[PDB]
Amino acid sequence: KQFDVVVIGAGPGGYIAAIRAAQLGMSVACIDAWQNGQGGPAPGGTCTNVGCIPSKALLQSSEHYEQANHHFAEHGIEVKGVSLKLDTLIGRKNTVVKQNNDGILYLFKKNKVTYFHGKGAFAGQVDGGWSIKVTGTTDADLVAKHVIVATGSSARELPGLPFDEKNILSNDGALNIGAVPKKLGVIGAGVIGLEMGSVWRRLGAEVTILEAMPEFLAAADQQVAKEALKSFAKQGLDIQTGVKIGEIKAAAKSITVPYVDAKGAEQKLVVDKLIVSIGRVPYTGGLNAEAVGLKLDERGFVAVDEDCKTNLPNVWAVGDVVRGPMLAHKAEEEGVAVAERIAGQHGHVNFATVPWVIYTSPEIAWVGKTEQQLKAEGREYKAGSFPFMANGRARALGDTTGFAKVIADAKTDEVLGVHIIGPMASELISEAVTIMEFRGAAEDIARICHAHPTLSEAVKEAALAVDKRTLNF
Amino acid sequence: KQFDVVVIGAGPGGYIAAIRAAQLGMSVACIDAWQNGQGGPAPGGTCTNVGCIPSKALLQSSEHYEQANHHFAEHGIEVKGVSLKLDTLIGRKNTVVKQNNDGILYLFKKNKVTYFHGKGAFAGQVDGGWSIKVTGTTDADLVAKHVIVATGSSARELPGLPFDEKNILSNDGALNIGAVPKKLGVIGAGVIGLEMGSVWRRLGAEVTILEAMPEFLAAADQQVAKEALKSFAKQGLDIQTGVKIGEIKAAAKSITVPYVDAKGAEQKLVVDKLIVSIGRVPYTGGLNAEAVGLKLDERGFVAVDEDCKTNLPNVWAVGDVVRGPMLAHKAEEEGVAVAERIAGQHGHVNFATVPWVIYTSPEIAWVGKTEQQLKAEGREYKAGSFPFMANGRARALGDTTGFAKVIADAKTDEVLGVHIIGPMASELISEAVTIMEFRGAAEDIARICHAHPTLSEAVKEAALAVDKRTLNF
Ligand SMILES: Cc1cc2nc3c(=O)[nH]c(=O)nc-3n(C[C@H](O)[C@H](O)[C@H](O)COP(=O)(O)OP(=O)(O)OC[C@H]3O[C@@H](n4cnc5c(N)ncnc54)[C@H](O)[C@@H]3O)c2cc1C
Ligand SMILES: Cc1cc2nc3c(=O)[nH]c(=O)nc-3n(C[C@H](O)[C@H](O)[C@H](O)COP(=O)(O)OP(=O)(O)OC[C@H]3O[C@@H](n4cnc5c(N)ncnc54)[C@H](O)[C@@H]3O)c2cc1C
Numbered sequence A, B: 001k002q003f004d005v006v007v008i009g010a011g012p013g014g015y016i017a018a019i020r021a022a023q024l025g026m027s028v029a030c031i032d033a034w035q036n037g038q039g040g041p042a043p044g045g046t047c048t049n050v051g052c053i054p055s056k057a058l059l060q061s062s063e064h065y066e067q068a069n070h071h072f073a074e075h076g077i078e079v080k081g082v083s084l085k086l087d088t089l090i091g092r093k094n095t096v097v098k099q100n101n102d103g104i105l106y107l108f109k110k111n112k113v114t115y116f117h118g119k120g121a122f123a124g125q126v127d128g129g130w131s132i133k134v135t136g137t138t139d140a141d142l143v144a145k146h147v148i149v150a151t152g153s154s155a156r157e158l159p160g161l162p163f164d165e166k167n168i169l170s171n172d173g174a175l176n177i178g179a180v181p182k183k184l185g186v187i188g189a190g191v192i193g194l195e196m197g198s199v200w201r202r203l204g205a206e207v208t209i210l211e212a213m214p215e216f217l218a219a220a221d222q223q224v225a226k227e228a229l230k231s232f233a234k235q236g237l238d239i240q241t242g243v244k245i246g247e248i249k250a251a252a253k254s255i256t257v258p259y260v261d262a263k264g265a266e267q268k269l270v271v272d273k274l275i276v277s278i279g280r281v282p283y284t285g286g287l288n289a290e291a292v293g294l295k296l297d298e299r300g301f302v303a304v305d306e307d308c309k310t311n312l313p314n315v316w317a318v319g320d321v322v323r324g325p326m327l328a329h330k331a332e333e334e335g336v337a338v339a340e341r342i343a344g345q346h347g348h349v350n351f352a353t354v355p356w357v358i359y360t361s362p363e364i365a366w367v368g369k370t371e372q373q374l375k376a377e378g379r380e381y382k383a384g385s386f387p388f389m390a391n392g393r394a395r396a397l398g399d400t401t402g403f404a405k406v407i408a409d410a411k412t413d414e415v416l417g418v419h420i421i422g423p424m425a426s427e428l429i430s431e432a433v434t435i436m437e438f439r440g441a442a443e444d445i446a447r448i449c450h451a452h453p454t455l456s457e458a459v460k461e462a463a464l465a466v467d468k469r470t471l472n473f
């Protein structure tokens, strides 16, 4: 059948692109191959099925378990015992994932987006535009004037160590371990590795995280990374950076990771389960790109210009499969912008104001540039910081770890970056993204009324600190 | 000794005004009479000692107690034999109050504010400005060019029923009950009554809240008020509005509250303790306003103009003792503005962007105008809302109660109000205040990238709803 737009993929980029295009009056088809455990439709891509949603769910349940075991007596809460029912914990997450799968199907129905459960591939050009063939769980021959490629990503594998999701786990297996492992190994100390390592440590595993890169969380503000590393060590996450990993061997019983530590001493990490979190790679498997001449760069990303247009007429690409931050909200921003451009509008995507969030305890969130980056560009700046120990709400909450930091241009006072480590950082950062979108100044934050007592007041005080006039520190 | 500024009161308005005046290079004295348990200094006024700080502390601890008893099973956390050590819970709050008292003393030292622990009063006008006499815990005779009256408030009492903080409790007694009462009565269903009722209900009390006003939370958005009443009823708070309260009598460890319900039937509420939370009244006890002819209104508020100036030259008044929202951040806004005006600057205080927050579960937070106010002034608007049930972070969290609402001008799209009921609403509202301070539009909120998954996304979606184009609902 004929459509104005065919969207290949139903992850954050594709499902939103489809909905936005439908709002703009277009007949839209969205093709997605993801399957649930019983082989049925499971929209939402990586984020819903093996990504943001399930990882955030396990982080919350594991945080409650940590609270029950170590932080309730100080509140006058006495217990006779605490035990884990892992099937129920994993079960709640599975239910949330399913709710999200169903919810997206419902959204497609409401918006009259035609959903095809299967794999979509380019067949060629025809009179009506592009011929897209659907195979696998559904067979269909579609035609569309515009095609939006939103095929996403796959977990990067360590060379010679394929994932089996039983003992050698990607993000997929990490979210489905059937029993808390005695000893868990994690390769990669980036956002995903820290989150996954935190989950399982809280549930009872001894966790060791090995990172080949010498610098820990290099993209985070220096002050943030240092404080985070300190908190993670206290929590019991044995993080080792600057290591050289050898040939990993997965035997029936033990997985042995031989490595040379940072000091140059030989080591062997012996674990019951291993999670490998060393990045994401763009996915175009089965898209039949090469056949129609759709250009990919050397890393496998679909090549696009500033407006997400590929080399083929009326073929666009968004999300993890193209350049830029590999984040759900980035994919969604591009999906919306491409639908609007197809409709004849301008669209808006600005990577400079995309926020980054780590959902560990403490939470970490930032938007804009770090001090390191500003120094690298020779951009004169002033930074102000305020600790949660001095915040009334953090004190009342019983969680005073961390700080808020605002960095401004030394001459114009324009806010160039905001960095937060502490309670609810993921939510507090919204205010900073807003300020940056208006190209606001540190003094603007400092002069905006913040409700008392709230964690948000730390952002105001950090801004006051830029001008050496914090009121509560 | 001679000071440029003498501030009478060390609550949010006064301690902040004093600090700000000192930052601006003026010589400042701050006089405050509050005493801790041992009769020593205890800065921070109502908010620190018997207000915001301890109330938020008990709310969090009692919420943890509630979580342990009812919301941990679903996360796979089996906690057996949960019990309460009330003395430890109250003790944690007492330690936090002391941290805040000590913190303000340190801020005064750091900023070179001369602190006088005692009662400050006008003596008369002199050539150097105003003669201020300190008595009680300190004896001193000061001369100030400018005086800032920040004497705060006290608890409103029912005629014939004085507080004793044993059986008939104000906010003071409510934060120090020695044992969980089997049956707790609360007169007043406003912010404090709902918060205090929630604390003690979670800890084991059967709570009944009686309110004379026929409308529940009349100042809030009606949809927010309606959902709130539904949530509180479900939680076990028996809230009755439009009742006529008779003569309350306490005797033999019991308290009888005769009343006529909204349907004209006599009733009798028999409880073990009674909290009366029916408002706050301005306090100027011992200020000696008559000696200098300082004008007070018929309720006892210090009369002031739009810039917080009284009828006496160089005498200003801020916070709860003057007109406007009786809130901590409002007092701070005025203290800062007055110090800035004394220094020769313009100052800025805008009640239209002052946020209101209720720290119940769910939390309630709003800023700006409600639909009912806009209808009344005949200003055409557009409202949009989004439920947390459709938000990925709320789902992951396991708390999907409520929604976010954005109200915009129908012609200019300028945001006129934002109303939120749900998880972390107190923190999410900061984004709305910031938008209003920049005179931003609903479309601005909608275009701003919000991190996924975060509760803040609900604010973005509510803004999309204003233009009838929500994506995830
Ligand atoms: C463990 C983990 C945690 C994460 N947490 C967060 C977080 O907290 N916040 C955040 O912003 N981001 C997070 N991410 C990143 C986020 O998941 C991605 O950035 C986002 O999913 C990218 O969306 P997308 O639509 O571009 O691609 P994807 O989500 O990968 O969706 C691609 C979809 O297309 C389908 N597909 C591919 N090829 C075809 C074809 N030929 N035909 C039909 N269908 C096809 C796939 O089956 C898939 O459903 C996380 C990732 C992981 C792995
Ligand atoms: C239970 C409760 C919970 C609350 N929760 C919140 C909340 O969550 N958020 C919020 O914004 N607001 C809250 N409030 C309101 C908040 O406490 C007040 O709005 C705020 O304290 C007002 O500050 P202020 O400086 O004007 O007065 P106050 O805090 O009352 O301080 C006045 C100070 O002056 C002293 N004083 C008075 N006269 C003299 C004199 N002659 N000489 C010397 N000292 C004197 C008093 O002892 C006191 O220390 C709450 C109030 C209560 C009762």
Ligand SMILES: [Ca+2]
Pocket (backbone or CB within 6 Å): B217, B218, B219, B220, B221, B222, B225, B370, B372
């Ligand atoms: Ca109302």
